[PDB]
Design a protein around this ligand. Structure first.
Ligand SMILES: CNC(=O)[C@H]1C[C@H](n2c(-c3cc(OC)c(OC)c(OC)c3)nc3ccc(C(=O)NCCCN(C)C)cc32)C1
Length: 307
């Protein structure tokens, strides 16, 4: 799999001491833990999200996902702490936390902006691409790509996190996991075909194109925080101005499906070559027609050529 030898994995949870709680939400809790005096991140899942714990555990153990831009899996366990049975996912610890939180604390220059977005595109392309052979991997669509599910490294690269909603496709196999409704992710980031439920649930490539829509929104979030001529925008989530907090499906449908609105491009971006290029790139992620959207590899290539 992606983590420790497995026999090691079961013993890891018992060797971990939880030191600080660094995150808490409806998903559960995230802690900085220590394993042999080395930091690890321990996500303790709420009962609401227990199935996400199981699906992510299945995945990381059935596919050996190892990539610098994917959160590094260490182990998963159903363990007991303080006499309560708990669902733990243990990964590499990234002190900087989520991109969402990071963008609200500092601003970016051209180098650090491009490093962030390129690393996300590289991670997403690695998820998306199916690799044949005994040491390959199925294609993976994330289905909840957003800034809260991206972690920042000290070196300024990022890695994609939270595969609990991901769907896998082997070009050999048939059927896509999917199941239930297609509207499983974060409403604010949902593509038009999800919101209006016209997505072809049987076509795996539909899910990759949904990730690309969300990636375009993440690019917009990040680009706002890149300084140009001492100018920068405050952090805002996508569509902050046109929809309420915790927006409903109907809110999103009118903006994105009926009006076909997209996040607004700050005028000052067209005073800077990099931001001008990023604006064009994100618009090619937001086509109403999913098949017109760029692929993750095309985005990666374009970003590598920008400087
Ligand atoms: C998920 N929601 C949240 O709000 C946050 C993000 C999540 N976090 C993870 C993490 C872990 C996962 O598995 C273990 C996981 O699932 C695979 C996952 O999914 C997205 C994320 N490592 C983290 C390491 C540090 C921090 C942190 O905040 N501060 C430290 C100082 C930085 N400060 C100024 C912003 C948060 C971490 C808690």
């Amino acid at each position: 799999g992606s983590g420790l030898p497995f026999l090691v994995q079961r013993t890891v949870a018992r060797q971990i001491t939880l030191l600080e709680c660094v995150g808490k939400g409806r998903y559960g809790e995230v802690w900085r833990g220590s394993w042999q005096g080395e930091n690890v991140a321990v996500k303790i899942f709420s009962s609401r999200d227990e199935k996400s714990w199981f699906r992510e555990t299945e995945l990381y153990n059935t596919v050996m996902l190892r990539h610098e831009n994917i959160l590094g899996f260490i182990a998963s366990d159903m363990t007991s702490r303080h006499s309560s049975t708990q669902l733990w996912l243990i990964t590499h610890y990234h002190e900087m936390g989520s991109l969402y939180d990071y963008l609200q604390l500092t601003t970016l220059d051209t180098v650090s902006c491009l490093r962030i977005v390129l690393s996300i595109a590289s991670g997403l392309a690695h998820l998306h691409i199916e690799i044949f052979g005994t040491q390959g991997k199925p294609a993976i669509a994330h289905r909840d790509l957003k800034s809260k599910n991206i972690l920042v490294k000290k070196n300024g690269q990022c890695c994609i996190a939270d595969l609990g909603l991901a769907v896998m496709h082997s070009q050999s196999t048939n059927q896509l996991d999917v199941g239930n409704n297609p509207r499983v992710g974060t409403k604010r980031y949902m593509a038009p075909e999800v919101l209006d439920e016209t997505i072809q649930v049987d076509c795996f490539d539909s899910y990759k194109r949904v990730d690309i829509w969300a990636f375009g929104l993440v690019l917009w979030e990040v680009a706002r925080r890149m300084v140009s001529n001492g100018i920068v925008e405050d952090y805002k989530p996508p569509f902050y101005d046109v929809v309420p907090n915790d927006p409903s499906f109907e809110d999103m449908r009118k903006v994105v499906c009926v009006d076909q609105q997209r996040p607004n491009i700050p005028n000052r971006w067209f005073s800077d070559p990099t931001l001008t290029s990023l604006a064009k790139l994100m618009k090619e992620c937001w086509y109403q027609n999913p098949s017109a959207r760029l692929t993750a590899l095309r985005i990666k290539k374009t970003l590598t050529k920008i400087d």
